[PDB]
Design a protein around this ligand. Structure first.
Ligand SMILES: Nc1ncnc2c1ncn2[C@@H]1O[C@H](COP(=O)(O)OP(=O)(O)OP(=O)(O)O)[C@@H](O)[C@H]1O
Ligand SMILES: [Mg+2]
Length: 264
């Protein structure tokens, strides 16, 4: 349905493992969007041609205001192009670098949007598994949008696919190569909540082997400015036992969330 000559390419929006994301405009409608470019050679070498099929299949059939839209795809002989909704206020990763940390109001609002979006995914037995600040984008009204469904799968799942990045947002069960379900995203929510308030994830380290030990043992401490209410929600989500992690409804109902989350 689409080809490269249908778009006017603009500036790079960001960079990923298999290529860049560019701002683009559809020549006929003048529709501004983003094009995620992936090199075929790289996907073959890494053996991630599946995963890319999953990202397209899963994300194309999701419709939620806090989930980034995947309008379609196309390809040539060398590259694969994903047609995405353009998020104009960038990443939560960049916002965090600018502010250093976020207040309870901004944190609680982001956690609400994330829990709402994850509740919709989990209803369709879709587990994201790669909820990282670089994958959380911002709409024109500054609302959070979950993006990058490359690691998404239908639950329950095991993993043969090896992890090549930081272990900071991954639960003990994923790190150990064990079985897992939707409770993986509940752990990631707790890691993000801590990082939004503190400015660094609770198991950050100089080495991968050290991070693994901290995650495996659930070895974290709160700075003095973290409030009782915030400590309570983070400590409820960062449970070694996946079955002990709360339901997303309990996250949305938490007193600290209700008290600081901005109302639409
Ligand atoms: N629609 C978009 N609007 C604005 N910026 C975007 C958009 N999509 C991606 N970006 C930017 O490009 C970066 C890379 O995008 P993305 O997470 O989709 O790629 P990836 O990490 O390489 O993919 P994968 O995990 O599937 O292998 C983002 O972190 C962000 O900075
Ligand atoms: Mg990414």
């Amino acid at each position: 349905q689409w080809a490269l000559e249908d778009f006017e390419i603009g500036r790079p929006l960001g960079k990923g493992k298999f290529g860049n994301v560019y701002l683009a405009r559809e020549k006929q409608s003048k529709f501004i969007l983003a094009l995620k470019v992936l090199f075929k050679a790289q996907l073959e070498k890494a053996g991630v041609e599946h995963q890319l099929r999953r990202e397209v299949e899963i994300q194309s059939h999701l419709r939620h205001p806090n989930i980034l839209r995947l309008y379609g795809y196309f390809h040539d002989a060398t590259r694969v192009y994903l047609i995405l909704e353009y998020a104009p206020l960038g990443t939560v990763y960049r916002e965090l670098q600018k502010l250093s940390k976020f207040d309870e109001q901004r944190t609680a609002t982001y956690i609400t949007e994330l829990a709402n979006a994850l509740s919709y995914c989990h209803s369709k037995r879709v587990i994201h598994r790669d909820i990282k600040p670089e994958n959380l984008l911002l709409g024109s009204a500054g609302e959070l949008k979950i993006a990058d469904f490359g690691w998404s799968v239908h639950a329950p799942s095991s993993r043969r696919t090896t992890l090549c990045g930081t272990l900071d947002y991954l639960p003990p069960e994923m790190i150990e190569g064990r079985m897992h379900d939707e409770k993986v995203d509940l752990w990631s929510l707790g890691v993000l909540c801590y990082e939004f308030l503190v400015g660094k994830p609770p198991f950050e380290a100089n080495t991968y082997q050290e991070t693994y030990k901290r995650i495996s043992r659930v070895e974290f401490t709160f700075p003095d400015f973290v409030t009782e209410g915030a400590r309570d929600l983070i400590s409820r989500l960062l449970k070694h036992n996946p079955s002990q992690r709360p339901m997303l409804r309990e996250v949305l109902e938490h007193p600290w969330i209700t008290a600081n989350s901005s109302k639409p």
